[PDB]
From a paper:
Fibrillarin ([name]) is an essential and evolutionarily highly conserved S-adenosyl methionine (SAM) dependent methyltransferase. It is the catalytic component of a multiprotein complex that facilitates 2′-O-methylation of ribosomal RNAs (rRNAs), a modification essential for accurate and efficient protein synthesis in eukaryotic cells. Fibrillarin consists of an N-terminal glycine–arginine-rich domain (GAR), which is believed to be important for organisation of the nucleolus, and a C-terminal domain with a Rossmann fold that is characteristic of class I S-adenosylmethionine (SAM)-dependent methyltransferases. In the present study, we determined, to our knowledge, the first crystal structures of hFBL in ligand-free state, bound to the native cofactor SAM, and in complex with two fragments that can compete with SAM for binding to the cofactor site.
Author numbering: 86 to 100, 105 to 318
The structure:
Amino acid sequence: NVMVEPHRHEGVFICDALVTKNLVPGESVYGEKRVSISEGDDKIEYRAWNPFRSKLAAAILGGVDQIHIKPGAKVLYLGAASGTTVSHVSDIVGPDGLVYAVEFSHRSGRDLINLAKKRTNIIPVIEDARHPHKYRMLIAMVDVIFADVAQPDQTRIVALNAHTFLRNGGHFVISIKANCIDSTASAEAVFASEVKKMQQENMKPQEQLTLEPYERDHAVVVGVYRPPP
């Protein structure tokens, strides 16, 4: 019998409970259940990925077609907060991948620094994502931008970082909480507005989905950056 099986998305696994292969066997990050499977000389530990705490997990269980975060990927994560979702991105991309974890708050910043001590593939960037000039000498060109900044001007911020850092034909994964962008617009009016802005900055949405039952009026938009010459 196979307990934990590869998910469709490479680097992800399903036990329906989503899990990622633990980069730091023995350690939990936010009190998540851990599941170690030993057979003979082999051994592999997984980490439970809670969809009520991670918008990315909620999107995966909601049936998103692509996440682009994959083994070996270079990921710029905007809005890294304390590292909950970032820790699972770190598992997915693996030792040959890279996760830049940008977060403004220095409180969450300290949780991120502790998380990165264990995970070599995390770079904490405790800076304001509005001003990429302050940190662009630290960021090699990335394959994916994941954004969860939760601001009304989130999309311009994300686009500013994509212009600087995202490779052509690179992808983005943007989490949009409607009442943080504009609590007096309907969720459909926010999502349509934000998707339009993306398209105007050559961030071409390829798919979108909401996150019920885990979150209300919360969308994830996945797409591709195809900038001009």
